[PDB]
């Protein structure tokens, strides 16, 4: 003699894929600054749940795809309305820079002249700029001239790595996994529900993960499949390591009028002696972190198995080097001096034409930056592959994994407040 | 109002039923509701969809004659084929998550029987004048 | 329907209470609801926001057990600390604008106490069967 009773506001949920919305940090054309999410701050909206063990899987987390999708969209929106350097896709007459250049810089700098347009469509002007060899091809020409359109990044737009917070839309909630030493998948006995996530900086890099979070206790090593040599392995350090990168050669830039309201920024002569870019790593801490990684790798590969670290062999800059972005300049640094050990000065190169995500070109043309650059970052993690004694090398992957490494603690579910149960009550 | 919310889920259905307003009060406003059409259009789309979801559940309660209140008695008997547990067994030992899974198979059937409120309204008019 | 609207505000709360539907009937349709995405998008955004505002107030009334009707008795006693006037003093000498300012300080407190309708619903089920 039981009856159907309808209940509304029932605390149940199911996995779902929805759009999460960003939130800003208040405190001004720094990209995120225009595409503001509206500031939040007093939002420590965290509730502990008892029991209700739930499962997580960081390699199936759709939030990663959203981060990728919107950051790339915003990148284009911020840089679309700029100059479009059609007139620079011309023949270059180049010579060598003969200034006081060290051995490590020989062949790196070219002095090139060309016939540039003017604001008055009758006349041409003779213009020259210094160029780096990685962006120039001998036939000379700009290296991407025969492939796709080239632009110039707006000089007032700065893609600063400002942390962005994400929050659920109404009808949704985010479950945060607090399990200590969680390896990225399966049941998480300790979960809390939140309104929003902590902030994540949109740092794009290769090989080493910079300025992210640190592991709570131990160095964590996780991958979709530990024994699959076709997969990338994510290593999170419990101790930060500083890396000091510099760009020497104090310089200036010239503002060249190229059309009626259009300006190009040229690279001027170097003040003082000419040296290469480079990075400094403390050998003491590099040795410690690799030893810690090995101690943990041995858990799955054998503690009687010798583990070696080796160079990032591959076919290109975006594959073999450590990519950084400091001061608006793009660096491609040599890490072969780090991954050389069986169980520190790193020379570095720079470029102005950056494809970023391959596609068709984009070619934002990082403008020349005046003065010098000093940049110090926190190494918080590492991505490795194995070749199979076993050997590990710096790995690959898209920017997606520079999100996944932070996003792994959060999952979003859909709330379904209406349902029924038997009671003894009849209308 | 995350003063309390889905934490109710840690206990039994009986206990959880005493705090139903705790979740209801958190269903209409996301962060974008507290606060270049590129990118920003997504916030507009999300707000609209949230509204639609809310209204669909309210419409269903309206149709069943259960609009208003948290708990609605239906005058539709419970089928013996839907579950085989003591009433007190489900209210004291089961959670709502477990319950929802157990009777998922009968969702449409149960809802279809809530159409009976229409027959009740016709009877009520005839004897009401 | 500007046949009459906020003109009720010129008088006392008592008098104004007799014409509450006068304002309610004017809350869902702006000029854009009677009637190149550039510029026009603003009309779409405004219509959506108007809907959201409406629903949030309706949801609050739903939660309090006051959904439906213009006037709802709550069974929650009035605190002596909220005001110190004769009941007839406020209804005959004060306007709603004045009143809203006078007790603004207690808005959240009063609303928090309207959660008691949840306890009433649990009691009602137990003694209803």
């Amino acid at each position: 003699n039981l009856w159907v009773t309808v209940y509304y506001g029932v605390p149940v949920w199911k996995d779902a894929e929805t759009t999460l919305f960003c939130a800003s940090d208040a405190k001004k054309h720094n990209v995120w600054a225009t595409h503001a999410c509206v500031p939040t701050d007093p939002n420590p909206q965290e509730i502990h749940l008892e029991n209700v063990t739930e499962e997580f899987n960081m390699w199936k987390n759709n939030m990663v795809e959203q981060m990728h999708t919107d950051i790339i969209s915003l990148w284009d929106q911020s840089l679309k309305p700029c100059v479009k350097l059609t007139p620079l896709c011309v023949t270059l007459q180049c010579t060598n820079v003969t200034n006081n250049i060290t051995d490590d810089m020989r062949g790196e700098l070219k002095n090139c002249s060309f016939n540039m347009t003017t604001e008055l469509r009758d006349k041409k002007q003779k213009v020259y700029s210094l160029f780096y060899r990685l962006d120039v091809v001998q036939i000379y020409r700009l290296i991407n001239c025969n492939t796709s359109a080239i632009t110039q990044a707006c000089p007032k737009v700065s893609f600063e790595p400002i942390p962005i917070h994400y929050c659920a839309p109404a009808g949704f909630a985010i479950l945060k996994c607090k399990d200590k030493k969680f390896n990225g998948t399966g049941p998480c006995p300790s979960v809390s529900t939140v309104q929003c996530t902590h902030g994540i900086k949109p740092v794009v890099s290769t090989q080493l993960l910079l300025n992210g979070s640190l592991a709570e206790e131990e160095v964590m090593i996780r991958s979709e499949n530990i024994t699959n040599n076709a997969k990338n392995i994510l290593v999170q350090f419990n101790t930060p390591v500083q890396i000091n990168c510099t760009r020497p050669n104090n310089n200036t830039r010239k503002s060249i009028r190229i059309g009626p309201g259009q300006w190009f920024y040229a690279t001027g002569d170097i003040i003082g002696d000419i040296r290469q870019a480079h990075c400094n790593v403390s050998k003491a801490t590099w040795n410690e972190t690799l030893g810690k990684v090995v101690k943990q790798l041995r858990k799955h590969f054998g503690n009687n198995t010798i583990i070696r670290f080796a160079n990032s062999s591959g076919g290109d800059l975006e594959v073999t080097t450590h990519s950084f972005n400091c001061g608006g300049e793009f660096f491609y640094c040599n890490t072969s001096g780090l991954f050389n050990s069986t169980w520190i000065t790193l020379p570095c190169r720079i470029k102005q034409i950056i494809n970023m995500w391959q596609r068709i070109g984009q070619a934002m043309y990082a403008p020349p930056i005046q003065g010098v650059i000093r940049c110090v970052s926190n190494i918080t993690g590492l991505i490795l592959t194995r070749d199979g004694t076993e050997t590990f090398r710096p790995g690959g992957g898209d920017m997606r994994d520079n999100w996944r490494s932070e996003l792994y603690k959060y999952k979003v579910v859909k709330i379904e407040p209406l349902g029924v149960a038997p009671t003894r009550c009849k209308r | 109002v995350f003063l309390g919310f889905l934490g109710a889920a840690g206990s039994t259905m009986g206990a959880a039923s005493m705090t139903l307003t705790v979740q209801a009060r958190n269903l209409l406003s996301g962060i974008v509701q507290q606060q270049l059409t590129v990118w920003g259009i997504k916030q507009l789309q999300a707000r609209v969809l949230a509204v639609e979801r809310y209204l669909r559940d309210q419409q269903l309660l309206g149709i069943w004659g259960c609009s208003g209140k948290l708990i609605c008695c239906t005058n539709v008997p419970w089928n013996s084929s839907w579950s085989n547990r003591n009433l007190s067994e489900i209210w004291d030992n089961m959670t709502w998550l477990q319950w929802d899974k157990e009777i998922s198979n009968y969702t449409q059937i149960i809802y279809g029987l809530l159409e009976e409120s229409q027959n009740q309204q016709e009877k009520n008019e005839q004897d009401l004048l | 329907v500007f046949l009459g609207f906020l003109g009720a505000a010129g008088s006392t709360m008592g008098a104004a209470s007799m014409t509450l539907t006068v304002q309610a009937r004017n809350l869902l349709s702006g000029i854009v609801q009677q009637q190149l995405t550039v510029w026009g998008i603003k009309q779409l955004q405004a219509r959506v926001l108007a809907v959201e505002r409406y629903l949030r107030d309706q949801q609050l009334l739903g939660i309090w057990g006051c959904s439906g009707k213009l006037i709802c008795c709550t069974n929650v006693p009035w605190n002596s600390s909220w005001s110190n006037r004769n009941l007839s003093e406020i209804w005959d000498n004060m306007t709603w604008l004045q009143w809203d300012k006078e007790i603004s300080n207690y808005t959240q407190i009063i609303y928090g106490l309207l959660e008691e309708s949840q306890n009433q619903q649990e009691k009602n089920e137990q003694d209803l069967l």
Partner: antibody
Amino acid sequence: VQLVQSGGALVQPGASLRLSCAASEFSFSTHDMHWVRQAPGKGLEWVSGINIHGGTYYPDSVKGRFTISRDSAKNSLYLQMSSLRDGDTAVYFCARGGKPIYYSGGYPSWYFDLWGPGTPITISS
Amino acid sequence: DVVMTQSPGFRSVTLKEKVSITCQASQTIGTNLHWYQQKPGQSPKLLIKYSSQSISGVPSRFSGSGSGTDFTLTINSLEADDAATYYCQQTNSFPCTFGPGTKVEIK
């Protein structure tokens, strides 16, 4: 108003013990109640708690060994502990959870307005 | 977990001095910090809640503020009766946690 407490005790390792508190001049049925313990030289470790609807919360440091219960009829609280260790030596206290800023349902505020006098337990051979 | 620390371990103060001690969190706790005091042989007492709210029964000379990871407790003019060990607790993230305490000795 106070939390009236039982006296202290000495037990052997592996022993079980029941502690209790009572509500003087108030009802326990209107408050979330918690137990904490103060080991010599330490601050207050939260041990357990029960909400107004009978739901409970436990630390992983005691979960499976400690149980919290309430009997509102007599205005009493209990803490039942099994398999006690020397490391569990502490002064045990009951405390009345502080009033929350806004309604949460049976979800504690995790801070306290009312503290009892303290009941020491020594576990030793 | 939220790790809470306090500084100094103890403070040596004298009467009618304006004094202060601080608390820190390893991670942001918003404004969910509460201050307590305890005297030897006594049960604990709560003095300040939610970073800056007053509590009836607590003298007006006690005040404080803070957010995120950094909080301060102060006494406008120290009294002999204020000797105590002062403690911070956080309620932002479960398990609830507390710091080691700062002892205030009065001369």
